Amino acid sequence: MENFQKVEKIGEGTYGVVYKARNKLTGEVVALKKIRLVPSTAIREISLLKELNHPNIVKLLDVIHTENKLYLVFEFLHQDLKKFMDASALTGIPLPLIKSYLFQLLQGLAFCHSHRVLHRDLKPQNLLINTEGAIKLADFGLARAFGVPVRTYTHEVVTLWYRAPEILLGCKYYSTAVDIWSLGCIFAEMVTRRALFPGDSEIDQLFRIFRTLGTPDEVVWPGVTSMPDYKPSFPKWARQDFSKVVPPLDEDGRSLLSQMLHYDPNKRISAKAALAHPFFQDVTKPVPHLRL
């Protein structure tokens, strides 16, 4: 902590505050996260994260466990996907770049999934971009370490918008499919320039998903009716056309999203399978127009 000079606050997560900071010795510019809470298992989970290195995962440079406090020192990235979407709002992010970004996030996901590590809380604000055309996942594995509360330390309400329905229906065992779901939500938002399911309570979130995708039943999702928060009294809505949901996404794009948004997590496409989907046949890596 005293080895770093704070430059500016750049965010507030479910785990505490994030600063751009500079390392007083080496000169390195990092993202410094002080974790609010250190339990011996948090230490051990977090230390596993230090080995989980990939070009599409924000590098955890150091864990500083000092004075009974916990700091995470990350590779610094200058912008998030929310800010970039908002800045690209008038014409949309070009599809070639959407495709490149979706392709890289799926590589990062396939990587972490293959090491049995989930994100659990993907969202535009933890997807980070550079001037080189890269996109990276931030805070991977942190939710399994400190817990996703309803409010942050500053009382900010956590988004439900990207939450998978198995989580909303109270499944205690998350699988990697929850990340695919969130990433599918983000894909749709990139394309349409609107959030797919902007719920403002758990039942609002659920009911927005049902209105678009049809209330789930035993046909499409064996087991759904026996989940902890499933209620027979849930209204039964019919599905909508994806054609109606993400114009002007093309047929390959629509077919992948549909597989990323399958109700049953066991039918939901894997990151590795989605990488082989025809939508990526012509993937490229454009450089974005970034104002920093």
Ligand X SMILES: NS(=O)(=O)c1ccc(Nc2cc(OCC3CCCCC3)nc3ncnn23)cc1
Joined tokens for residue 196: 């797919």
- Choose one: 34-42, 74-82, 260-268, 269-277; the region binding ligand X (CB under 6 A): 74-82
Binding ligand X by CB under 6 A: which of 4, 19, 22, 31? 31
The answer on whether 269 is annotated among ligand-binding residues is no
Phi, psi of 149 (to 5 degrees): -85, 180
CA pair distance 252, 258, nearest whole angstrom = 10
C-alpha closest to that of 146 among 11, 45, 1, 47? 45
Q: Which is nearer to ligand X, 64 or 220 (CB)?
A: 64
Joined tokens for residue 201: 């309570």
- Choose one: 79-87, 170-178, 221-229, 262-270; the region binding ligand X (CB under 6 A): 79-87
Report the amino acid identity of residue 53.
Answer: N
136 CB-near residues (< 8 Å, 6+ apart): 55, 56, 57, 58, 75, 77, 104, 108, 127, 128, 129, 130
Binding ligand X by CB under 6 A: which of 79, 159, 192, 259? 79
Smallest separation, CB 138 to ligand X (Å): 4
For residues 126-185, which are near ligand X according to CB under 6 A?
126, 128, 138-139
The answer on whether 10 is annotated among ligand-binding residues is yes
Smallest separation, CB 61 to ligand X (Å): 10
Catalytic residue chosen out of the listed positions 62, 86, 121, 229: 121
Answer yes or no: 121 catalytic: yes
Q: Which is nearer to ligand X, 9 or 69 (CB)?
A: 9
For residues 211-270, which are near ligand X according to CB under 6 A?
none
Binding ligand X by CB under 6 A: which of 60, 73, 77, 190? 77
Smallest separation, CB 291 to ligand X (Å): 10
217 CB-near residues (< 8 Å, 6+ apart): 224, 225, 236
CA pair distance 225, 214, nearest whole angstrom = 14
Smallest separation, CB 287 to ligand X (Å): 17
Smallest separation, CB 42 to ligand X (Å): 18
Does 78 participate in binding ligand X (rule CB under 6 A)?
Answer: yes
Long-range contacts of 262-268 (CB under 8 A, 24+ apart): 263/165, 263/213, 263/216, 263/220, 263/221, 263/224, 264/220, 264/221, 264/222, 264/223, 264/224, 265/164, 265/166, 265/175, 265/177, 265/178, 265/181, 266/177, 268/177, 268/180, 268/181
Does 62 participate in binding ligand X (rule CB under 6 A)?
Answer: no
Binding residue positions for ATP: 10-18, 33, 75-77, 80, 123-126, 139
Residues at the interface with ligand X (CB under 6 A)? 10-13, 18, 31, 58, 74-80, 83, 125-126, 128, 138-139
